[PDB]
Design a protein around this nucleic acid. Structure first.
Ligand SMILES: [Mg+2]
Ligand SMILES: [Mg+2]
Ligand SMILES: [Mg+2]
Ligand SMILES: [Mg+2]
Ligand SMILES: [Mg+2]
Ligand SMILES: [Mg+2]
Ligand SMILES: [Mg+2]
Ligand SMILES: [Mg+2]
Ligand SMILES: [Mg+2]
Ligand SMILES: [Mg+2]
Ligand SMILES: [Mg+2]
Ligand SMILES: [Mg+2]
Ligand SMILES: [Mg+2]
Ligand SMILES: [Mg+2]
Ligand SMILES: [Mg+2]
Ligand SMILES: [Mg+2]
Ligand SMILES: [Mg+2]
Ligand SMILES: [Mg+2]
Ligand SMILES: [Mg+2]
Ligand SMILES: [Mg+2]
Ligand SMILES: [Mg+2]
Ligand SMILES: [Mg+2]
Ligand SMILES: [Mg+2]
Ligand SMILES: [Mg+2]
Ligand SMILES: [Mg+2]
Ligand SMILES: [Mg+2]
Ligand SMILES: [Mg+2]
Ligand SMILES: [Mg+2]
Ligand SMILES: [Mg+2]
Ligand SMILES: [Mg+2]
Ligand SMILES: [Mg+2]
Ligand SMILES: [Mg+2]
Ligand SMILES: [Mg+2]
Ligand SMILES: [Mg+2]
Ligand SMILES: [Mg+2]
Ligand SMILES: [Mg+2]
Ligand SMILES: [Mg+2]
Ligand SMILES: [Mg+2]
Ligand SMILES: [Mg+2]
Ligand SMILES: [Mg+2]
Ligand SMILES: [Mg+2]
Ligand SMILES: [Mg+2]
Ligand SMILES: [Mg+2]
Ligand SMILES: [Mg+2]
Ligand SMILES: [Mg+2]
Ligand SMILES: [Mg+2]
Ligand SMILES: [Mg+2]
Ligand SMILES: [Mg+2]
Ligand SMILES: [Mg+2]
Ligand SMILES: [Mg+2]
Ligand SMILES: [Mg+2]
Ligand SMILES: [Mg+2]
Ligand SMILES: [Mg+2]
Ligand SMILES: [Mg+2]
Ligand SMILES: [Mg+2]
Ligand SMILES: [Mg+2]
Ligand SMILES: [Mg+2]
Ligand SMILES: [Mg+2]
Ligand SMILES: [Mg+2]
Ligand SMILES: [Mg+2]
Ligand SMILES: [Mg+2]
Ligand SMILES: [Mg+2]
Ligand SMILES: [Mg+2]
Ligand SMILES: [Mg+2]
Ligand SMILES: [Mg+2]
Length: 75
RNA sequence: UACCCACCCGACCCGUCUUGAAACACGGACCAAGGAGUCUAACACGUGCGCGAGUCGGGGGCUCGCACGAAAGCCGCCGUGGCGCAAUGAAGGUGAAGGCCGGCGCGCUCGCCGGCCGAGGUGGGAUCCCGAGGCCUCUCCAGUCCGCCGAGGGCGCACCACCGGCCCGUCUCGCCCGCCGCGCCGGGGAGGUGGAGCACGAGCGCACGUGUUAGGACCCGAAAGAUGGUGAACUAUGCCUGGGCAGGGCGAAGCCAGAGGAAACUCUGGUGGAGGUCCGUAGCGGUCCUGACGUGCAAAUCGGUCGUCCGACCUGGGUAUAGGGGCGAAAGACUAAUCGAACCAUCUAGUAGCUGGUUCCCUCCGAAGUUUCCCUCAGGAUAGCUGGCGCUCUCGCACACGCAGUUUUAUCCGGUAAAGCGAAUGAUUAGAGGUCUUGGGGCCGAAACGAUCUCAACCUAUUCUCAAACUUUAAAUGGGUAAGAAGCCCGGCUCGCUGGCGUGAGCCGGGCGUGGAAUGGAGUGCCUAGUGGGCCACUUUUGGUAAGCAGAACUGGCGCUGCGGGAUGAACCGAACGCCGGGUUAAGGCGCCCGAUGCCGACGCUCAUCAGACCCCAGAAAAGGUGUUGGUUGAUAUAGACAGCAGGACGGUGGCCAUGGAAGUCGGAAUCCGCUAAGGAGUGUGUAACAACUCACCUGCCGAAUCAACUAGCCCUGAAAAUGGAUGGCG
RNA sequence: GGUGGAGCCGCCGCAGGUGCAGAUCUUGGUGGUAGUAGCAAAUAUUCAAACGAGAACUUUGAAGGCCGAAGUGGAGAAGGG
RNA sequence: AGCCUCUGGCAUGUUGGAACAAUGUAGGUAAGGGAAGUCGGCAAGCCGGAUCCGUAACUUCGGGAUAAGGAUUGGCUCUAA
RNA sequence: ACAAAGCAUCGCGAAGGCCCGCGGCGGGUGUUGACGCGAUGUGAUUUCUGCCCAGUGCUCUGAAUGUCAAAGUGAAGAAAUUCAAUGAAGCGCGGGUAAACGGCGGGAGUAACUAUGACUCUCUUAAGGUAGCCAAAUGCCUCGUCAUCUAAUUAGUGACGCGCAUGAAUGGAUGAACGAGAUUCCCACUGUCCCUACCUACUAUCCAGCGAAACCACAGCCAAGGGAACGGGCUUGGCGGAAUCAGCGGGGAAAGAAGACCCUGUUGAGCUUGACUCUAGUCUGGCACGGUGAAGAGACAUGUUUUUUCACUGACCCGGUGAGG
RNA sequence: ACAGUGCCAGGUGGGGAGUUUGACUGGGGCGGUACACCUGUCAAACGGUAACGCAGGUGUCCUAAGGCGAGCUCAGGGAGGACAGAAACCUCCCGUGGAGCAGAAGGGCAAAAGCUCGCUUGAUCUUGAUUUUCAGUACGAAUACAGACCGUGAAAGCGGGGCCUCACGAUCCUUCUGACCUUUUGGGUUUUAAGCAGGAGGUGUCAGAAAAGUUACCACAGGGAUAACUGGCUUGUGGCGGCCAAGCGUUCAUAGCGACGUCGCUUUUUGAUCCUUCGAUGUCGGCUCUUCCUAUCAUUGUGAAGCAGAAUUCACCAAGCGUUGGAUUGUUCACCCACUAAUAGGGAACGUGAGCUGGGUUUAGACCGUCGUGAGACAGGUUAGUUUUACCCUACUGAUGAUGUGUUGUUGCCAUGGUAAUCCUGCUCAGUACGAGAGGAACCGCAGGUUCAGACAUUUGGUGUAUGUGCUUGGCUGAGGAGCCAAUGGGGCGAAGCUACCAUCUGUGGGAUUAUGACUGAACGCCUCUAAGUCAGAAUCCCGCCCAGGCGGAACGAUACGGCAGCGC
RNA sequence: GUCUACGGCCAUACCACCCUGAACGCGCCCGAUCUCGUCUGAUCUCGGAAGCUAAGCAGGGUCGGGCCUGGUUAGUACUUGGAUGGGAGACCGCCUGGGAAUACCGGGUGCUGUAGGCUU
């Protein structure tokens, strides 16, 4: 009662019948695995983006009206 | 079309297990009727229907003697209750909200008080809305109606990716607490981490399908185990009571006479009739023919021959011992044709990873023999491979992104083939060179690196040959990425990390489109059967001598698959099959079987007393062969060769060694001149040695091509096996 | 078309013990084998008559024979009924 | 005992007829040779009753033993006991 | 083969040995008593019965300072408890036993041919195979060597004995009588054979009558080829003429039986023991029924406990009888 | 006051019960462990890959053989230096690693990872993430971080065991440790127990059963997935045969041989292998019988010889016909005796069991030896042990027939099959050839034999149931006579008929050539058996005689008087 | 042209020997009081500035060894695909593509980075 012991014979056929798929990658992949001292900081960076939104909003209208002036000075 | 018959071509018997079945594998004489995936419960997903944060359904109840009813209808019962509506901790238990703004505590990323919004954000997002601009309309212009195209811009479901946030458990760290009590009281924060969680829901009930189980469980199938029972009419013993065993042989004790002797007693002749005694009927048994018979007269009989036949003999009836028990002069014998453990019924449809079977058509899709784990190796589990069900989108609706058993263009990765060993390591030959060192022997030396050798080991330049477990080098095929919108380029915010400043990452806000060739609609989720014995071929390759052997790689097949071809045939060559008419091919073919050369086919090769005749494939080797045909190279030659026929083949010379004979000649050192024309101090014949003969060498005659070694083609030799015989046959 | 003598099918739905070639399948039936193997253990029958539809086989007579009194003879037990 | 017969009992033991092939199964017999046969003298045949003679090794002194080996055997007419 | 007489061990004086039974104050041996019963071994007679008690058994008025439980007693604690002392049988230790199971070895030198070795050295163990016997039914090498028997002998008989692997009641050696026991040889005999022949009966054969069965996919002429690697069928050849009778044993890998061998199965049974887990039975202790009286002693304590011994008779037990002194 | 019974405790207990007695495995058993791991290789340059493929290692060891930090330099060699030499100690020079780094190898390592010192516990406490085997689960092992507490160093840094790749272990259970933890349930306090979180006690069959045998008394489910026959493939081994040629052969390679080497055939040896068969193909020998092969032992014909004759080896055409009788043995095989012309070798399912036999293997009974505590085991012996069925189809042997030929009969032909004869002695040749002598042939003839075919019965023999005829035993017919019965009463002699190397008779001819030897005669102005041509030539082959007579013919005869006929031209 | 300090790539830089170095530096060098370390001020640590390029270092030189690159070896060895190609077989040829390694010949022999000198 001896038997065959191994083979990779038609295996290439099988796992290429559904066509080996390179793993579908999205933008924004998970941060799990990054060192904690990065996250433990970058979460504080993300948590207090809003404190300082007034500067951001007015300074946006500054360049938005300076480039509404830049596109109108071209006109 | 169906009945019978005829013909040409095709054609092996089905089912089955199987790598492979027409099989010298098994089931199958034939025909009828019967005959095998069921019901229940429990999950799971899909699907249909009712209602929907609810929704039932049961048990009850209220309504009938039912005809239809043991139905239907109805009931704050309808929620007692289940399931859902909420999790998380072992548990005490806690328990899903955040944002924002203003005000007040020091805004301290901490604590408290008033107001607003309420499930956060980013990226895709079916997609609706808004729409610049076009596109006409019989005029120039005016202008409201109608749509088509529509760059660009907005909301953005479902879903996916991500970042945040909240609940609980645990940890870390740290702050302030509230006070019906005192704080070994309770309460809040920041950061990480465990969770089957929340983050404005989707369940309940009822059907049907598929799948997995528990059930006898797709049908049939054990050897067994258990509980109760019935048997000694067979046979095994014991007991009780009955019945039976011709005729002969040997001849024991006892006894009687006679005779000896002194006595003990001993002889001789009788009697006598003992014995698990002999022959041998009846009886009981069963040795040998390995006879008869062997679908018998017989589920063990029949003949001849045999054993025993007054005793541990044979028997009849009565009675005792009953199943892990009996009984045994003991063979595991016998116990009612049954015995290494009876028969009967039940538990029982015992269990089976193992055989066998498994019932109508058509249509579409279509495998595996591999992965890890298993008291696993005939089985499962999980991977794959398969199907079904879908969904999410794309846009051939003049207006596409995406992927890929591709290839380019860049760019990394590699240690195999080859190569090398005057590069390492490991082997290894030779010489030259070296008292390298040194030696061990020598020979010439008292001894002496003195001389000359020698061999050993080393090493200085060299040289021969090697390595799968060696490597300076170093391919081919091959493996990664990359070839943009998730991309670039500006502007600005945030940080508890990082730092002289900046880094870096994260965010918000704007600015810009086809980025190599060729192909094609892509993405994603559920259930899930079968399979988990494989086999063959090119190439690579491991054992083995080799195998139709054992074991891998890579692809392809066969299994799962027919057709043309290979005579025949799984697997070779072509080529993959809906049913047909025409054409044309592939691999193969084209004398005849047998479609096609019934070419005025080319050019050659070969004759076999064993011819040769097509990938897999089925037959042969070294070695030969003036058999014939080509070459190759070297020869020879009109100063006349080759061959043929004629003359010489000698002298110096019994040369020297060898004497045993070698004056040329068993053998060898050799070993050259004279006559020269030419004769080798000899090719051989032989002769003890010569001679004699002959051959090289040279001549005489003849008239032009000849000779030798190799090499390859075909045919021959080498070539021997058994029922007659196979290029498929004829030929 | 025929024979047969009393019930039966189409469509829309529901329910099954629902389709057989096979299991050394079950039951029943029937072949080929085949008018074959066979009707061969213990020596043996023959003649005439009777009866009768019918005689190798019954019955009677005659003849030849065997069992041969440890019987194939005459009576019983158990068993049979 | 076997073999033949009276007494008694049967009718060849689930059939008959025609033939004498091969094989058989049962029985028989063989010239010369005699175990050369075969695994082995398997089977068969040699012996066989009685009377008269005769008897070994060995021995547990009982046996061996019917050891072995020889002779005789009818019918008739007598005789003796 | 068993049995057997015989020989031999072994237990046991009856509350006994062996043994049955589910249980009783139950039964067998036992209507018994050591010349009896039960348990084994060898196997008449003759002649013998050798060494070994280390191993495993069995057994022993045998020490149980080894261990060792239930209860029992002691101590701490609040109590479950915990910890102490002690100690039965068997186990450990020590005697005996082989007619219990069984065991009974290996090396060198050395004598005046050679060889062999009386003799002498080590080593080991529990003794190291003694009397005998052997190529035996026991011997691998093996057709051992010699002789005998044959023309010729792996056969037979007889001797030889470093005997793979003989041997003393797991009995050794013998051996008259006996044997449907196993061999070998000789005489006689023979169809066993050279070498077959004929004769008889019953068959078979044919006929009248009567009539089965096993078996059967389809079936039935061969060679070679291929093929699941030995075809009847297929390829290519060879060929083929109705329907049958007696024979016949080449073929149908003929029938008969889901191979008795072998291997697998997480399928069994029978038997074994040093397997695992248990059991009836039996040995020992404790507790209970279990009392009365007597002495006396130790230990602890300053009564308790342990109780040792000797009595008693009411439970209980056995014995006898027609319950008679 | 114990016996004894009732109940608990310890011991003893194959007397009894139940059960187990691994897997892999070129069948299994015994051997190994490829059963968990690790190196180098195999492995075909990514990774990954098999076998009881190689070459090896592990179940460890370390208080430093770890963590830092310094500080140096190793193996080996040369030259020196009192005892001191190939080796102690010192000094200089050379020294890419040729040392060392606990161990197997493989990688890695130089003001190091090596060696020497000083200081030490990063071998500590704690979440996650990832890699490695992978299902992309664990365990093990590892890699990066982060949070604490530290060690070390001026410091940068390094360090959570050992320079890297191996050195290890689930559930349940047990124990230890941790928190003023939780539960211990109607409250409360203490014990006690249960949780929670980490370690340990272990499963080596290493994803983890608590486990000895035997069966020859055996059973069942299966298996040609797995042996023991045959057959295939293969051909080591076995057998048979070539090539080269150093040598043997007095001389001389090749008459006969032939080393060192090398190429093959063969399936009559054994193996390997496991394709076929396990709902069974009857598994050794011998007996009988046929046929076939030639790798020729004899005989016919020949060539060779170290062939004078005789004898004998070598080779060619050749399988026509031969190849025996016995002793031992189960044997195949073997050995001998004896004969012969020779005692060649083989195939046909290792031909042949519905053909035999059953001696050997190989059931159950027994016996010894060895082994085993035992049941039992033993290619160790030994004795006893059932051998079935044919009537079916085919083949074969005989036997009737069959369609055709108008019907019949007679005499015939021949297609095709079959086929048969064989060897020896004696005499003569001749004591001749040859030889020196010893020795010693042949062809032609003649006489016979062996083996084998075909007959046959005159004689000899065998049988004999003419139941022919005598002779006899027992009985039976009253006796004589005549007979009968006793499975053929027994025995003599016996006709016919069958029948025997146990009697007798008969066995027959040509053709074409093989091997071989020759002729003419080329290629190759010679020579050649050959290339074209010819000749002799045999147990061979074919035919003749001999046997059969075809879905093959031939010639000739007679052809239905009839009462009904019917035809032939 | 050049050095010193710290370097990057790590031999075109190494090794062996030969020749030449103005000035700054680098060095040799001179001492052991303090710091520090040794058996030894040899090395290391420290205080120095009398001498010299003797050496390191720099720079050159060698028909130098080594390395680095080309040529040749060679379209050779090997190989992706292909055939009903050859061959008894070993193997070999061709088609479609890719394409090495020695021996043997050439050429080269350190490029630079920052900060400071010197040649003012
Ligand atoms: Mg098979
Ligand atoms: Mg077959
Ligand atoms: Mg089967
Ligand atoms: Mg059981
Ligand atoms: Mg018989
Ligand atoms: Mg018969
Ligand atoms: Mg009868
Ligand atoms: Mg199967
Ligand atoms: Mg490699
Ligand atoms: Mg399977
Ligand atoms: Mg009616
Ligand atoms: Mg129904
Ligand atoms: Mg039906
Ligand atoms: Mg009679
Ligand atoms: Mg009567
Ligand atoms: Mg009769
Ligand atoms: Mg009757
Ligand atoms: Mg005779
Ligand atoms: Mg004989
Ligand atoms: Mg014989
Ligand atoms: Mg006899
Ligand atoms: Mg006698
Ligand atoms: Mg005894
Ligand atoms: Mg004794
Ligand atoms: Mg003892
Ligand atoms: Mg002795
Ligand atoms: Mg004797
Ligand atoms: Mg004999
Ligand atoms: Mg003897
Ligand atoms: Mg017949
Ligand atoms: Mg057969
Ligand atoms: Mg299993
Ligand atoms: Mg069992
Ligand atoms: Mg035990
Ligand atoms: Mg048991
Ligand atoms: Mg196994
Ligand atoms: Mg590869
Ligand atoms: Mg250091
Ligand atoms: Mg840390
Ligand atoms: Mg270390
Ligand atoms: Mg309480
Ligand atoms: Mg046995
Ligand atoms: Mg037995
Ligand atoms: Mg097989
Ligand atoms: Mg075989
Ligand atoms: Mg010579
Ligand atoms: Mg195989
Ligand atoms: Mg059969
Ligand atoms: Mg020949
Ligand atoms: Mg045979
Ligand atoms: Mg046969
Ligand atoms: Mg038979
Ligand atoms: Mg036998
Ligand atoms: Mg036996
Ligand atoms: Mg004995
Ligand atoms: Mg024993
Ligand atoms: Mg003479
Ligand atoms: Mg008379
Ligand atoms: Mg002629
Ligand atoms: Mg000729
Ligand atoms: Mg002629
Ligand atoms: Mg100094
Ligand atoms: Mg200098
Ligand atoms: Mg200088
Ligand atoms: Mg150079």
């Amino acid at each position: 009662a001896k038997s065959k012991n191994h083979t990779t014979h038609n295996q290439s056929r099988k796992w290429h019948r559904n066509g080996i798929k390179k793993p579908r990658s999205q933008r924004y992949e998970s941060l799990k695995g990054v060192d904690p001292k990065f996250l433990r900081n970058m979460r504080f960076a993300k948590k207090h983006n809003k404190k300082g939104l007034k500067k951001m909003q007015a300074n946006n209208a500054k360049a938005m009206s300076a480039r509404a002036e830049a596109i109108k000075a071209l006109v």
